[PDB]
Write a protein that holds these residues in place. Structure first.
Motif, mmCIF file in Angstrom:
data_model
loop_
_atom_site.group_PDB
_atom_site.id
_atom_site.type_symbol
_atom_site.label_atom_id
_atom_site.label_comp_id
_atom_site.label_asym_id
_atom_site.label_seq_id
_atom_site.Cartn_x
_atom_site.Cartn_y
_atom_site.Cartn_z
ATOM 1 N N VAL D 48 0.848 -1.183 0.000
ATOM 2 C CA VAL D 48 0.000 0.000 0.000
ATOM 3 C C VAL D 48 0.886 1.237 0.000
ATOM 4 C CG1 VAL D 48 -1.941 -1.158 1.107
ATOM 5 C CG2 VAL D 48 -0.217 -0.030 2.516
ATOM 6 N N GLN D 49 0.415 2.277 -0.679
ATOM 7 C CA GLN D 49 1.153 3.529 -0.801
ATOM 8 C C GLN D 49 0.807 4.407 0.393
ATOM 9 O OE1 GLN D 49 3.285 4.182 -3.615
ATOM 10 N NE2 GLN D 49 2.940 2.001 -4.017
ATOM 11 N N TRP D 50 1.764 4.586 1.297
ATOM 12 C CA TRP D 50 1.581 5.468 2.440
ATOM 13 C C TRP D 50 2.124 6.842 2.080
ATOM 14 C CZ3 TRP D 50 4.813 5.192 7.587
ATOM 15 C CH2 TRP D 50 4.330 6.160 8.475
ATOM 16 N N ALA D 64 -10.053 -11.604 3.861
ATOM 17 C CA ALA D 64 -9.010 -11.010 3.036
ATOM 18 C C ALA D 64 -8.147 -12.069 2.367
ATOM 19 C CB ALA D 64 -8.137 -10.072 3.871
ATOM 20 N N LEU D 65 -8.117 -13.284 2.917
ATOM 21 C CA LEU D 65 -7.426 -14.418 2.318
ATOM 22 C C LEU D 65 -8.364 -15.251 1.450
ATOM 23 C CD1 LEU D 65 -5.303 -15.581 5.390
ATOM 24 C CD2 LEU D 65 -4.469 -14.306 3.414
ATOM 25 N N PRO D 131 -7.197 -3.276 0.338
ATOM 26 C CA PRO D 131 -7.667 -2.715 1.607
ATOM 27 C C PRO D 131 -8.757 -1.671 1.392
ATOM 28 C CG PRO D 131 -5.560 -1.769 1.017
ATOM 29 C CD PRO D 131 -5.812 -2.876 0.037
ATOM 30 N N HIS D 132 -9.427 -1.338 2.491
ATOM 31 C CA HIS D 132 -10.346 -0.211 2.549
ATOM 32 C C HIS D 132 -9.675 0.914 3.321
ATOM 33 C CE1 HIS D 132 -14.167 -1.647 0.814
ATOM 34 N NE2 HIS D 132 -13.802 -2.838 1.249
ATOM 35 N N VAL D 133 -9.665 2.100 2.740
ATOM 36 C CA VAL D 133 -9.013 3.246 3.359
ATOM 37 C C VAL D 133 -9.991 3.912 4.314
ATOM 38 C CG1 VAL D 133 -7.515 3.561 1.359
ATOM 39 C CG2 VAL D 133 -9.661 4.841 1.513
ATOM 40 N N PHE D 134 -9.449 4.540 5.351
ATOM 41 C CA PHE D 134 -10.247 5.428 6.175
ATOM 42 C C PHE D 134 -10.438 6.760 5.454
ATOM 43 C CE2 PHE D 134 -8.666 2.560 9.550
ATOM 44 C CZ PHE D 134 -9.853 2.272 10.187
#
Lengths: 237, 101, 205, 237, 205, 237
Positions: D48-50, D64-65, D131-134
């Motif tokens: 993921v790009q932080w 998620a798996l 993922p789901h972002v906040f």
């Protein structure tokens, strides 16, 4: 990265300690009262801004600890006294900063006035917490001759490495620790009118950096009066 | 301390007892219960405050030393705090929470 | 010195979780239902929502008033039990559904319910689906509590109000959980409005 | 810099491992078949790009798996199951990068819909690998209320340190390892319709850097289902 | 032979320390408050003022009359408890505040209160300030006692009078003190009018 | 005629000592710092003029030691404290003088205002070193009801002999010594806002003499705070 506590104070601290003249501070009609509790706590002075053009600084002790809590308070109450003065200097510089300091103590560092004919009025030597800076060139007036290449004393600044000293090379280490076991002829003297030693910090290699770094490096001085004792106020038996 | 690994500096954390007044300068904070926390050396500073029970103590922080930084690392940094029990905490008279209406 | 900070001392204390009234003569207003849940009272819900899994026995004490000698039936149906749809429904006569018969003037009735879940603990939070509906499982189902006057009729009109006191017993809890910041919107879901972490302050100093 | 292999996979790996609630995953009419071979292999998700503006991420497990090889394949075949989920998070950040992450697992992390009156349609919670972002502010609609300061659950995000958690401070360490010993009331549950825990990664101190560095820091999540077991397909004796 | 001169035999005996009435239907006259103090009755106050520090448990027995079957709630709030401002205030439903539910005709209700002070003893006298106000400390705070009818309403007008009997238990006292000479002016302070030491006499012989 | 020293002070001193309630002062999250050096030294107050018309005096402690050197100084620095207060009263009267005093300590001596409806404004109770005199008759206003026959408290002044007391009969002895072992419910209290005991000196038989003698008798009060301790300023471990 051991951090040593002492009293109600704690400082975080190359554990190379320089003991002045190989002697550790010790104790001793006449009746001296020694305050073990308090006094010994570290007294951290204000940090100084070291820059490319900074020629140097000096402090005169015990008079630099004039307002430092109980130790300065005791100086007023007690006529006579003596102490030991562990001094910690921590440069706190980045890897991309270069420079070299001489941290030296110079006991009985009598200084000379700028205008040789007249003498300075007692406050050009010392202000309590704030340091006195050196100068790059000669100066005139009724102030201390604060030109480096002479360190205010008339001796050469290069061969001033004979006193208790430490070298802070930002390439190698950023810390210094000197212990000064109360050098004096009389066993007790008045702290107000007598300056036992003069902590002076002199940059031999100047601070240098590139444009993105911080334009300065703050040097922090920390003093702990060890084995301080005074005279007895109460009547003898 | 949540800043860069290349950054360094000193922060003076001073705790004043409940009776005492809050320090006004860094010098008055140094003349008390304090800890000079070297940020370049260690990244965490733990302190256990006593006499917290029911005018309480004040904890303060002061720039002893500015954050010295190289040309590559960013100047502005952040600090996080963590409060927890210091292994006692006796609680005696249970009541109703003042949070939920 | 922290004896009172235990789960039994914290969770285990009776609270008035259900207020309702039911007339003696006249349809669906002649009995009280109250499907048993821990999400009724907002003060007790905040405590049970500090733990993900809880395991306890239930002791209820009903407090019945009125406005002849009146006798009341408090019938408890297990999670698989038949529910009455009318005051005279045959489901009141079921032997399987334990019921107390309390006549007015005596000490209030008390009924004790064991750990009746199929699983090993009640869930305060269920991240999952029934198939469906989110956040609902049949593992933390505790039954219903049907309450009526056993008297056939009265010449006067009598309205009886009942208070139910719910006290967990032999509480066991697992997996601590942070206390809830936001207020409660609904009694079935966990939905919330975004609230501030703490009350504001003029400056950082 | 020991690198541990496991199955046909190997990852290179501050060896501080956080065991969730001090318990290690273990095994256990009813007859469970456990597949020791495979399944346990590391399943590395997409990085993921932080960035400076990144508010957070969350994954819901075991879902998620869902597509991760045999483990996801077994989820379809077997009605019931349980696993242990060693999770490795490796930030991979330079010295000139600053930031702080909270890597926390939060079992039974029931979330709330944005529009309180209506419920979300089952896919706002989870997509399998992504993922789901906040979000930074409040949102509206039929999606999960993904505003940090609440972590979607209604609790405060600061006191979310009570679950099995690890702190990734880029100044100190770039790695995290959490072990989650199958927290559930029933001994086996359907993986498809039940989410055992929610790995969510929240930046408390945001990412910061100067203009020459890379504008992001890629965070890599690695999951190994330990001690996975299922129900017995074949007839009993 | 002096067994009855002990503190338990002297201090420990029940006295009717609070008389009040409260109507069932109609505002603030529908419940009784009585902040618990030892300075209510002038006869019991003179006894507790012989000792500077006292340590005892409290056993109260309420005596409730009236002028349907009436049920009364006697709710005791601890010194940190929420106080109701109306008969229907939510504070009556607090689980933390222990309450008894007594219906008329049975033995009178009895509630027992432990030593709930923060310090080590209750103070009969406090020479000091709150900051403030003189002679007041929060160490000898014992709570309040809110009493109401749990019945929603009655067709007739019912007025119920309650008597509270306060009995110290397991009394421990310290620092003897002379008995008070002057009468009492107010129930909060120690203010007095200068009175004579003893009744006069015609001569010294 | 033994004279006892204590600290930097010495007083010359019928060696009958009254220990209050038969208990001697003793010591004792929470961490108390006790200053053994100093504090314990005798603090001699100003002598009071005892005359034929003198009704009495009272002092409220620890607040009467508000300005008495380090002990009063510590009261400002430390939030909590406790002490033991040896009190010496020496009348210093000639053989040709007659009189009788009651020196009594009266812990928690709550007093009443003169105007019953209103309360006194916090300074009618105590001024630090100077005593407050009683009155012979009733008074009015917002000051303490200072009429003897009641001692300001509402009790009879004759049966005020139940507290720790001593009788000074100029015919027999001119000295008194009372020890007050810190009577309080809480183990530590704020000295500024709480008065632990009230040393009041009441003449039962009035001073009398013939025309040649001195018109007064000066009573000297001496207080030594024993086993004084406070709270810990420094941080716990």
């Amino acid at each position: 990265v051991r951090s040593m506590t002492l009293g109600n104070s704690t400082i975080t601290t190359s554990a190379n300690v320089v003991v002045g003249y190989g002697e550790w501070p010790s104790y001793l009609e006449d009746q001296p009262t020694q305050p073990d509790v308090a006094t010994c706590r570290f007294y951290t002075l204000e940090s100084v801004q070291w820059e490319k053009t900074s020629p140097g600084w000096w402090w005169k002790f015990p008079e630099a600890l004039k307002n430092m809590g109980l130790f300065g308070q005791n100086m007023h109450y007690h006529y006579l006294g003596r102490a030991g003065y562990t001094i910690h200097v921590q440069c706190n510089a980045s890897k991309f900063h270069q420079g070299c300091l001489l941290v030296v103590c110079v006991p009985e560092a009598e200084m000379g006035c700028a205008d040789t004919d007249t003498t300075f009025p007692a406050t050009e030597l010392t202000t309590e917490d704030t340091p006195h800076v050196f100068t790059s060139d000669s100066i005139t007036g009724k102030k201390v001759q604060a030109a480096v290449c002479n360190a205010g004393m008339g001796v050469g600044v290069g061969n001033l490495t004979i006193f208790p000293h430490q070298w802070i090379n930002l390439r190698t280490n950023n810390s210094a620790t000197i212990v000064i076991p109360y050098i004096n002829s009389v066993p007790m003297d008045n702290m107000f009118r007598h300056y036992n030693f003069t902590l002076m910090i002199i940059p031999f290699a100047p601070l240098n950096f590139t444009d993105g770094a911080t334009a300065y490096v703050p040097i922090t001085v920390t003093i702990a009066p060890m084995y301080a004792e005074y005279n007895g106020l109460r009547l003898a038996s | 301390f949540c800043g860069s690994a290349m950054a360094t500096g000193k922060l003076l954390i001073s705790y004043s007892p409940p009776g005492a007044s809050v320090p006004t300068s860094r010098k008055d904070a140094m003349l008390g219960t304090h800890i000079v926390w070297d940020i370049g050396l260690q990244s965490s500073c733990v302190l256990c405050v006593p006499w917290i029970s029911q005018s309480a103590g004040y904890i303060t922080c002061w720039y002893q030393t500015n954050i010295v930084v190289p040309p590559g690392a960013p100047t502005s940094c952040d600090v996080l705090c963590f409060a927890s029990a210091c292994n006692d905490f006796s609680v005696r008279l249970l009541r109703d929470t003042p949070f939920m209406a | 010195s922290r004896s009172e900070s235990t789960i039994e001392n914290f969770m285990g204390r009776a609270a008035c979780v259900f207020m309702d009234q039911y007339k003696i003569n006249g349809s669906t207003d002649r009995f009280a239902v109250w499907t048993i849940n821990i999400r009724e009272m907002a003060q007790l819900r905040r405590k049970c929502e500090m733990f993900t899994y809880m395991r306890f026995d239930i002791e209820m004490t009903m407090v019945i008033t009125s406005c002849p000698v009146l006798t009341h039936q408090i019938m408890y149906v297990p999670p698989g039990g038949p529910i009455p749809a009318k005051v005279d429904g045959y489901e009141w006569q079921t032997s399987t559904n334990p019921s107390v018969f309390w006549t007015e003037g005596n000490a209030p009735p008390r009924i004790s319910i064991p750990f009746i879940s199929v699983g090993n603990a009640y869930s305060s939070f269920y991240d999952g689906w029934s198939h469906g509906t989110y956040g609902y499982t049949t593992l933390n189902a505790m039954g219903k509590l049907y309450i009526r006057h056993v008297n056939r009729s009265s010449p006067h009109q009598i309205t009886s109000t009942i208070r139910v006191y719910f006290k967990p017993k032999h509480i066991k809890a697992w997996v601590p959980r942070p206390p809830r910041l936001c207020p409660y919107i609904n009694k079935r879901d966990v939905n919330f409005v975004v609230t501030e972490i703490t009350d504001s302050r003029t400056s950082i100093t």
